[PDB]
Design a protein around this ligand. Structure first.
Ligand SMILES: Nc1ncnc2c1ncn2[C@@H]1O[C@H](COP(=O)(O)OP(=O)(O)OP(=O)(O)O)[C@@H](O)[C@H]1O
Ligand SMILES: [Mg+2]
Lengths: 398, 842, 39
């Protein structure tokens, strides 16, 4: 089974104000951590059997242990095993090995001298895949996202609600959506939403770049994708986030480009994993891309990617929410009227609002002030907002 | 480096500070006047760097000695002001404090907000540094606070004001200083800080907030804090002070929800309506409406709940034609719990005797109790069916019928008191089963009553040498759970005498664990009076001395969050030395029950329990799943369920049993399809062992409780309001489950029905001022505070639109999306009354 | 074993426990015989 390896996270300490309540909650966290440290330190200290078992098994197998590939199972205790050098050896299977675990192609621990099967290596996970697993959940939560109520609701119905409440889906008869593509202009909150869902989820989370799943050697790309998805299968409730799928999701086309055909083969293996022969199981996929129109139709089609969540440039209410969230830790003055920044049509995104807040803080620091003002925000708006050149036509239209 | 203005200001400051070398008359007034002017101008501005303070880096030693010798009048006071402002930036804590202490008073407001905050911090430091050896220094610090607090109140700095007032251990001034627009902020601050502050400051803070809420006439909140304090006199005071009959009805609803039944004098108008609401007679009816809103009138059958059509029938038509007793008991618990409180069942109502006749002894009691537990909160309706089975041929099952009565009267009260009348002539019954059933029914019917007549009637059972050990244990638990959280001296003395007269050989049994139980059940949430309790229990010899001490330590600090008690309990657990591991198990349950008071403490108790599981000895491994069940009752957190699923396949039968019960308790009433599938898989895997199958079917019944409309949470009012009756019920069930084979799998299945004492429903039925149901659009979502200490009601997000009545899962709250109505209680839980808005205009 | 700090309230608890406790209250030679061993 090998249930999910959910990322560990400390409880959120709120209020975020530098008050005594935050001190008390943080000191409660420190208290419990010290309790855990004391118990885990005095556990092995007071430890006075299985040592005979270890002294027999380890002595019999000996060190070092070679790692080979099982090729054939001839007898109940004899196997043809190929070493990493590609040389096959007819070796013996020692008694202290589960015969049901031995399968062709499995990674098998052999003795160094006689290469006899001393055990089976379970994980044998590519290091480029085990690094995709998330161990420390990101600090961003659903409370750090301003607006985006529809997008958050869709992503929760897709990858969150089925885990907590599969009762609705089972009762009505729907198979819950198992693929979501977060597409929109950059800086709108796609990666932020991925961070938030990773923080909230109780299922294992795999983060991919859409470009680290691509390897030098000819066949290692699709093989790496298959390994990643198999690992996702192992920890049954899983979420596989592939940021910037544009890297491999680009539309298929015919050209010589010996590397591009491997690119397309890798993406073909990806879409086979998403929806092909054999079921995919209880593993959700979240994909993010700035440009969706350049993606291959067979990748973003329903059944492979069930939902296409659009992240538009924030509107007035959403922008006001972003400003309220990102100046929450600030010390605003009384003359500040955030509205003037929220209005007008600068086409500023959530990342733009974050930079506006940061630059207003820097402007206040320039005047040796730890509290921001309206003038600082106004200066920061023009200082940071200068991104696009023209983006507009002339006075043709009345 | 500096600038032209900066250089000129630095030169001026250096000239002004250097002119103080000699004793010329036109020096001290001019120089100190100029320094005061510049410092006041810079400090009484925005948070810009205090340029005079940056320029000023001199030594005050000459300034301090001249302070000592020159001008005993106001000039030394000016010098004190200047050096205090200078040392606020530096580290001159004691000196910087005493400069404002003895120098020019003037006012702290004249300096600045940052100066006030720094002085507040230094005052707190000094007060913590000052013991009761002298009160001379305390008074001027109090005078400083007299002006510091209003500054914070008027400048929205209630944080620093509250913190300072907690450091000085004096909180009376909040009564006379809190404004209308700021009472909510400070009240929420206190109601959040009470959980983490240790004894005895938490109680003082709670009564301070109680006084504030009484002053501002927020009566429902006053009731909430009164039940937090767990003292009846202030509850009566609030009841008398409630002049609004709608608020009276609301507080009656909350009192019925908490199960607090206080006698009401006839001097209060509408006494009958308040009494009948507090007896909670209406609830079942509303529940019925609830069910007929969800079209879940039709009760279920264990065959469909187990989904036998999906299980791989490896043996078909040859291995399922034999009906063992234990699986029949499990099916009884299922076709009970699942269909409970819906007023109808398709197998126990039309085919009662035929069903019961295939049960033996214990099965008779279990099925008779489940017959009453299939219809909740209908005293007359329940007893109309229970009487015939009370008239049964096998009079031994008569006791079971009493359980039915005790399980039907649970959560309700009648003026004629059918339970007391029915069990008054049966408590003194000589038969062990008869007396057991009588006392259990009386306890379940009268949970939290604390009525003196029933306690006195239960007293002679303890002194009865004839009464068996299990009769004594059930009597002790019933006495404790009738007197939950009261520290009743009568019950305490009776149980102490009973345990003192008990012999070691008779104490060695498992049922003796229930003797401290009631004693502990008398002292829930009151750790102050347990020094005498532990002193009295120290007379008995070990190991049971340590066992009883640990159990009463759990019961005293139920939800207290006292990390020192948890440290003692963890030290007990970590000591690697059968009955010796009982102390470690009780201590593990103690960590659970202490940590469940706070969400942060509970979530760290999760990590501690994981470490205990992966690095503990067998007894700890058995004990932990009960603790995990206690931590997250009716809260199907997926990590907890995953750990329990991992350990349900353990080679230790006790560990697997405890893990299965933890599945049942944590996912109780959530109707989690994932949990249902995992339980079905566990039933398929464990199809051979009768005990594993029995407990997995019990877990399925618990998770399908009320078709997903029932919860066993001992917490209310945004999980802030504890429930003594529910905590008692889970405590009894868990400590009995510390020995699954002898108690749960032995002769004491009826103990499971104690969970029905904790059986509390979830709805959103909305009533008008006349108590008719009123459909109101409600915005329901997670209560994730997107702010800090802004006083917001957690700013409910994840919105969904519903029409009342609504079902709210654990951890998800509700709010009124319509301004047309105003709820008397801002906490939309259970039954509420909405007053029509007078401000709204059509 | 070892005792952890838990400095959150352990100092206050220990000082209040201290208040509660306050409320509660050569030769220089050897005689030798014939077979005497001497360094
Ligand atoms: N709706 C929002 N609410 C709050 N913060 C936001 C929002 N949108 C963006 N931000 C802020 O912008 C930062 C950067 O945005 P993010 O990482 O989500 O980019 P993106 O939409 O994934 O863009 P790209 O196309 O580059 O991948 C986030 O860390 C967050 O602080
Ligand atoms: Mg991004």
């Amino acid at each position: 089974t090998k249930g999910p390896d959910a990322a560990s996270k400390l409880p959120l300490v709120t209020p975020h104000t530098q008050c005594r309540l935050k001190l008390l909650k943080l000191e409660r966290i420190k208290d419990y951590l010290l309790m855990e440290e004391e118990f885990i330190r005095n556990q092995e200290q007071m430890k006075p059997k299985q040592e005979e078992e270890r002294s027999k098994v380890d002595d019999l197998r000996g060190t070092p242990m070679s790692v080979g590939t099982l090729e054939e199972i001839i007898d109940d205790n004899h196997a043809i095993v190929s070493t990493s050098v590609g040389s096959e050896h007819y070796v013996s299977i020692l008694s202290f090995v589960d015969k049901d675990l031995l399968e062709p192609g499995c990674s098998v621990l052999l003795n160094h001298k006689v290469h006899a099967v001393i055990g089976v290596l379970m994980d044998d996970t590519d290091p480029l895949v085990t690094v995709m697993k998330v161990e420390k959940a990101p600090q961003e939560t659903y409370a750090d996202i301003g607006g985006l109520d529809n997008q958050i609701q869709e992503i929760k119905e897709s990858v969150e609600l089925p885990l907590t409440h599969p009762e609705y889906y089972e009762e009505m008869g729907i198979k819950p959506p198992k693929g979501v593509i977060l597409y929109g202009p950059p800086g709108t909150g796609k990666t932020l939403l991925a961070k938030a869902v990773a923080n909230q989820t109780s299922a294992t989370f795999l983060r991919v770049v859409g470009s680290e799943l691509i390897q030098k050697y000819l066949g290692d790309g699709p093989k790496l994708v298959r390994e990643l998805f198999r690992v996702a299968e192992e920890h049954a409730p899983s979420i596989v986030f592939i940021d910037e799928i544009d890297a491999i999701g680009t539309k298929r086309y015919d050209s010589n480009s010996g590397g591009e055909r491997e690119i397309q083969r890798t993406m073909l293996e990806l879409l086979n994993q998403l929806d092909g022969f054999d079921s995919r199981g209880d593993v959700k996929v979240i994909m993010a891309t700035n440009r969706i129109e350049t993606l291959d139709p067979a990748l973003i089609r329903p059944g492979r990617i069930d939902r296409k969540i659009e992240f538009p440039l924030p509107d007035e209410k959403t922008k006001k929410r972003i400003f309220q969230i990102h100046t929450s830790r600030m010390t605003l003055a009384d003359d500040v009227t955030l509205d003037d920044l929220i209005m007008a049509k600068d086409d500023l995104s959530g990342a733009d609002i974050k930079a506006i807040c940061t630059e207003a803080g820097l402007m206040a620091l320039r005047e040796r002030r730890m509290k921001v003002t309206n003038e600082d925000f106004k200066k920061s708006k023009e200082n940071v907002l200068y991104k696009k050149q023209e983006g507009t036509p002339e006075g043709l239209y009345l | 480096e500096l600038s032209e203005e900066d250089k000129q200001l630095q030169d001026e400051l250096e000239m002004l500070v250097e002119r103080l070398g000699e004793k010329d008359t036109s020096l001290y007034r001019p120089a100190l006047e100029e320094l005061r002017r510049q410092i006041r101008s810079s400090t009484t501005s925005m948070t810009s760097v205090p340029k005079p303070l940056k320029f000023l880096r001199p030594h005050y030693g000459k300034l301090k000695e001249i302070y000592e010798n020159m001008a005993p009048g106001e000039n030394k006071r000016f010098a004190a002001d200047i050096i205090s402002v200078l040392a606020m930036t530096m580290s001159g804590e004691r000196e910087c404090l005493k400069y404002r202490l003895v120098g020019s008073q003037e006012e702290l407001a004249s300096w600045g907000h940052e100066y006030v905050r720094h002085l507040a911090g230094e005052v707190a430091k000094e007060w913590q540094e000052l013991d009761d050896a002298e009160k001379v220094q305390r008074e001027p610090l109090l005078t400083l606070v007299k002006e510091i607090v209003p500054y914070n109140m008027a400048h929205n700095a209630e944080h620093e004001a509250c913190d300072l007032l907690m450091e000085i251990e004096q909180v009376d001034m909040l009564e006379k200083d809190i404004d209308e627009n700021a009472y909510a902020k400070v009240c929420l601050y206190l109601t959040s800080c009470v959980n983490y502050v240790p004894e005895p400051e938490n109680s003082a803070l709670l009564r301070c907030a109680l006084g504030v809420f009484r002053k501002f006439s927020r009566f429902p909140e006053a009731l909430r804090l009164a039940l937090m304090l767990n003292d009846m006199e202030l509850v009566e005071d609030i009841f008398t002070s409630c002049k609004d009959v709608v608020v009276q009805k609301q507080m009656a609803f909350m009192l019925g929800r908490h199960g607090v039944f206080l006698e009401l004098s006839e001097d209060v108008e509408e006494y009958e309506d308040l009494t009948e609401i507090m007896s909670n007679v209406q609830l079942n009816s509303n529940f019925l409406a609830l069910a007929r809103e969800l079209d879940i009138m039709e009760p279920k059958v264990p065959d469909d709940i187990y989904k036998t059509h999906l299980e791989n029938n490896r043996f078909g038509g040859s291995g399922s034609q034999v009906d063992s007793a234990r699986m029949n008991l499990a099916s009884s618990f299922v076709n009970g719990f699942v269909n409970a409180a819906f007023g109808q069942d398709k197998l126990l109502t039309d085919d009662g005797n035929k069903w019961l006749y295939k049960n033996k002894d214990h099965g008779m009691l279990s099925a008779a109790a489940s017959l009453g537990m299939i219809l909740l909160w209908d005293v007359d309706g329940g007893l109309t069916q229970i009487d015939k089975y009370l008239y049964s041929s096998e009079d031994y099952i008569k006791s079971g019928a009493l359980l039915a009565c005790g399980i039907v009267n649970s959560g309700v009260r009648n003026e004629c008191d059918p339970a007391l009348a029915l069990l008054s002539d049966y408590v003194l019954h000589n038969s062990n089963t008869m007396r057991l059933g009588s006392i259990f029914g009386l306890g379940l019917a009268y949970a939290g009553s604390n009525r003196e007549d029933v306690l006195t009637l239960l007293l002679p059972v303890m002194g009865d040498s004839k009464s068996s050990m299990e009769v004594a244990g059930v009597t002790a638990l019933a006495c404790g759970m009738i007197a939950v959280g009261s520290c009743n001296g009568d019950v305490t003395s009776t149980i102490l005498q009973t345990i003192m007269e008990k012999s070691e050989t008779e104490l060695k049994d498992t049922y003796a664990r229930w003797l401290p139980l009631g004693l502990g059940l008398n002292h829930l949430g009151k750790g102050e009076a347990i020094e005498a309790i532990l002193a009295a229990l120290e007379v008995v010899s070990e190991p049971f001395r340590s066992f009883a001490n640990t159990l009463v330590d759990v019961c005293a600090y139920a939800g207290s969050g006292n990390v020192l008690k948890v440290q003692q309990l963890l030290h007990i657990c970590s000591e690697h030395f059968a009955d010796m591991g009982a102390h470690q198990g009780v201590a593990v349950l103690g960590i659970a029950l202490i940590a469940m008071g706070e969400e942060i403490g509970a979530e760290m108790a999760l990590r501690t329990f994981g470490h205990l599981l992966r690095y503990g000895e067998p007894t700890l491994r058995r004990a932990v799943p009960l603790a995990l069940a206690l931590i997250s009752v009716s809260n199907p957190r997926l990590n907890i369920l995953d750990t329990l699923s991992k350990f349900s396949h353990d080679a230790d039968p006790e560990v697997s049993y405890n893990s299965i019960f933890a599945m049942g308790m944590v996912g109780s009433g959530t109707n989690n399809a994932r949990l249902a599938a995992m339980l079905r898989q566990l039933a398929q895997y464990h199809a051979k062992d009768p005990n594993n199958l029995f407990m997995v079917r019990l877990a399925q019944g618990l998770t399908h409780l009320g078709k997903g409309t029932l919860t066993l949470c001992p917490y209310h009012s945004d999980r802030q309001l504890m429930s003594q009756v529910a905590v008692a019920g889970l405590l009894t069930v868990l400590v009995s489950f510390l020995d699954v084979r002898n108690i749960i799998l032995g002769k004491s299945h009826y103990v499971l029905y104690g969970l029905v004492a904790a059986m509390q429903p979830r709805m959103l039925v909305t009533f008008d001022e006349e108590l008719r149901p009123l459909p109101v659009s409600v915005r329901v979502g997670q209560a994730v505070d997107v702010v800090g200490q802004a006083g917001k009601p957690k700013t409910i997000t994840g919105f969904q639109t519903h029409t009342t009545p609504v079902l709210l899962a654990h951890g998800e709250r509700a709010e009124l999306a319509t301004e047309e109505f105003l709820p008397v209680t801002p906490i939309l839980e259970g039954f509420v009354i909405l007053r029509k808005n007078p401000n709204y205009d059509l | 074993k070892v005792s952890t700090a838990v400095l959150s309230i352990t100092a206050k608890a220990k000082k209040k426990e201290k208040e509660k406790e306050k409320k509660e209250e050569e030769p220089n030679f050897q005689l030798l015989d014939n077979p005497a061993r001497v360094m």
